[PDB]
Design a protein around this nucleic acid. Structure first.
Ligand SMILES: Nc1nc2c(ncn2[C@H]2CC[C@@H](COP(=O)(O)OP(=O)(O)OP(=O)(O)O)O2)c(=O)[nH]1
Length: 534
DNA sequence: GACCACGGCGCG
DNA sequence: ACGCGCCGTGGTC
């Protein structure tokens, strides 16, 4: 810092850069700087100076690296103080917060940013000393991962624009039809997009019972859950739910996506955020490609839009019940571990209401998804369509079949209260203080956040590690990693190597880290994201 | 134009 | 009575 010294910087310096916007793929490089040995180096011309650097180290290294790859420059990201802070406390998600917290100030000048990166790393890195397990995550997962992610953000994914443009016109017509029908029943036109106007119409201008109310402002809710219960109580309801689906997918996916194709690449680029979640998961944004619809017919039509480059094929890899398996391993429950040991499908195997294996099943498929979150009979009976206590009775059979689960939940909650945090299999930790709150609702909310983190975070660790190990193997085969959706990966491979890439990636993922239970991966190849599954 | 809270909903 | 990001609305600055 302080002493201004001419560019270029000495090797191994901390970089501070300024972008016109957050998205590195769309951002103009306004300023570039570096700091080292107590010196500040401000580049005369940012874009040119980019060539000098050998690797990116400093706050938000990956982003600068992404922009570098955009310009043909092979500039890999390295140390990033944000990554260290994220490992100390996953609540450290922003440079504004991190700086303020560890001896600095997040500015709009590259030099002060570069200097902030230098001292911020010194301090933070010191706080990580002794934390063997965290250091291991930083070196063996986080740091290397930042590079893999940088290459995914720069590669982007191919989108069938004309297809979506056409789908938009068809959906527009169907929306108009539902709009006219709803207005007819309402006896008058209003903003069907306005849940406020909808509330008045539904519960006041109609004999419709208000089931629940909104959290913050306490209005009569018009959530899908509420409307579901009223689907028979009125024709207009079903038409409103259908209107909801269409408008949701049209305004969020169908319309905005085509307009996001990058001019240089001709592909769709998302940002994979590394210090965003409280559990250790990745997040996707601008645009979010981890929530592309798939569960409904209309959603699946949208998913077909994501296609492979010509001469290429999409390879889709999904872990199967990875969080359940993580639980089986974390808890040590034999009667569960031995369900994945025998390769026996849990949902039907845990369909032990009587004996499989084989009738009421899928009621367990929702119990298994449900135990991870700590859902009670209410969310259960409602989503399963059964009496309130024809749901409670269920949940208790579960803890009797799998006692070691309850024991683990109990275990970690106790651990959490004591030291103030919980952790994953690899020692990634999340601080959750409200475990000692005197208000039950608040405390029981903290508890759910608390015992879910180790499970969801461990699965995140496994996927991350699997990506770090899988990446180099893909480069050697001229294949590329496109997207990650928490428990699934999407690769793009040349048709010829497609099947080879598929088999390899599968094994890299199944053996990423052996547990007291085998990890199972489903693999699919196709010209589009949808067909690449099944 | 920007950013906001909110209700709502897409995905794992 | 889990984890995210984005939409339109309604609203402010
Ligand atoms: N984490 C999470 N994932 C969900 C939820 N609802 C749906 N999904 C996604 C995750 C994977 C997929 C369900 O995968 P399963 O583990 O049921 O495996 P499957 O192939 O669907 O088996 P089956 O067809 O027998 O249900 O749907 C949810 O509430 N939480």
């Amino acid at each position: 810092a302080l002493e201004e010294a001419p560019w270029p910087p000495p090797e191994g310096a901390f970089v501070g850069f300024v972008l016109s916007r957050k998205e590195p793929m769309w951002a103009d490089l306004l300023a570039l700087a570096a700091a080292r040995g107590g010196r500040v180096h401000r580049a005369p011309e940012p874009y040119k100076a980019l060539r000098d650097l050998k690797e990116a180290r400093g706050l938000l290294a990956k982003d600068l690296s992404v922009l570098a790859l955009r310009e043909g420059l092979g500039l890999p990201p390295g140390d990033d103080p944000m990554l260290l802070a994220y490992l100390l406390d996953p609540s450290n998600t922003t440079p504004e917060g991190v700086a303020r917290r560890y001896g600095g100030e997040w500015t709009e000048e590259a030099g002060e940013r570069a200097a902030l990166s230098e001292r911020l790393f010194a301090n933070l890195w010191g706080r990580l000393e002794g934390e063997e397990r965290l250091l291991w995550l930083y070196r063996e997962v986080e740091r290397p991962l930042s590079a893999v992610l940088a290459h995914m953000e720069a590669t982007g994914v191919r989108l069938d624009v004309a297809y979506l443009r056409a789908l938009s016109l068809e959906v527009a017509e169907e929306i108009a039809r539902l709009e006219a029908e709803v207005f007819r029943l309402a006896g008058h036109p209003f903003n069907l997009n306005s849940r406020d106007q909808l509330e008045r119409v539904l519960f006041d201008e109609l004999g419709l019972p208000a089931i629940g109310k909104t959290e913050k402002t306490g209005k009569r809710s018009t959530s899908a859950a509420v409307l579901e219960a009223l689907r028979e109580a009125h024709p207009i309801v079903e038409k409103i739910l259908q209107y909801r689906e269409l408008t949701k997918l049209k305004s969020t996916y169908i319309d905005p996506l085509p307009d996001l194709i990058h001019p240089r690449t001709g592909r769709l680029h998302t940002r994979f955020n590394q210090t965003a979640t409280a559990t250790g998961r990745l997040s996707s944004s601008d645009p979010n490609l981890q929530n592309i619809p798939v569960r409904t017919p209309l959603g699946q039509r949208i998913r077909r839009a994501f296609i492979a480059e010509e001469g290429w094929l999409l390879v889709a890899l999904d872990y199967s019940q990875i969080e359940l398996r993580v639980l089986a391993h974390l808890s040590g429950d034999e009667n569960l571990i031995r369900v994945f040991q025998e390769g026996r499908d849990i949902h039907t195997e845990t369909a032990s209401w009587m004996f499989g294996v084989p009738l009421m099943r899928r009621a367990a498929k929702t119990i298994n998804f449900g135990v991870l979150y700590g859902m009670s009979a209410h969310r259960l009976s409602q989503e399963l369509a059964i009496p309130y206590e024809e749901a409670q009775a269920f949940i208790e059979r579960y803890f009797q079949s799998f006692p070691k689960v309850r024991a683990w939940i109990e275990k970690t909650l106790e651990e959490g209260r004591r030291r103030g945090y919980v952790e994953t299999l690899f020692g990634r930790r999340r601080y959750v203080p409200d475990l000692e709150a005197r208000v039950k609702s608040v405390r029981e909310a903290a508890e759910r956040m608390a015992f879910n983190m180790p499970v969801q975070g461990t699965a995140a660790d496994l996927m991350k590690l699997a990506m770090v190990k899988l990446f180099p193997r893909l480069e050697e085969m001229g294949a590329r990693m496109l997207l990650q959706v928490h428990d699934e990966l999407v690769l793009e491979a040349p048709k010829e190597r497609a099947e080879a890439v598929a088999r390899l990636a599968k094994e890299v993922m199944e053996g990423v880290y052996p547990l007291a239970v085998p990890l199972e991966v489903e693999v699919g190849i196709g010209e589009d994201w949808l067909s690449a599954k099944e």
